[PDB]
């Protein structure tokens, strides 16, 4: 359940691979909520690759979805992300994510 929403411009040639480390601005928004967390404000655009299980589920195949430069739109189903257990005082039980991404990466 991953819908990607984009913002147009980029390549949408250079798709991430594995063994590939990347670099996401990404920016948190709960659906009827506010912002949870926020790539923007540490200044720090957060180095991860892909194939390690290291994000969530409803992240990682949308990395894969994009290409350089682009800008999409994340809107992720509860149980790929946190819908059973909820992420402890941060996340509630079974919520809807939506994410503001922006690949700029290297590799």
């Not at 040639?13 to 990404?26: A, I, M």
């Not at 720090?44 to 409803?58: D, N, S």
């Not at 979805?65 to 819908?83: E, F, H, I, N």
């Amino acid at each position: 359940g991953v819908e990607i929403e984009t913002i147009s411009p980029g390549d949408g040639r250079t798709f991430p691979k594995k063994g590939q480390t990347c670099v996401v601005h990404y920016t948190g928004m709960l659906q009827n909520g506010k912002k949870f967390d926020s790539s923007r404000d540490r200044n720090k655009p957060f180095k991860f690759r892909i194939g390690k299980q290291e994000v969530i589920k409803g992240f990682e195949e949308g990395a894969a979805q994009m290409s350089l430069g682009q800008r999409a739109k994340l809107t992720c189903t509860p149980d790929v992300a946190y819908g059973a257990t909820g992420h402890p005082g941060v996340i509630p039980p079974n919520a809807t994510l939506i994410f503001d991404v922006e690949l700029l990466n290297l590799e």
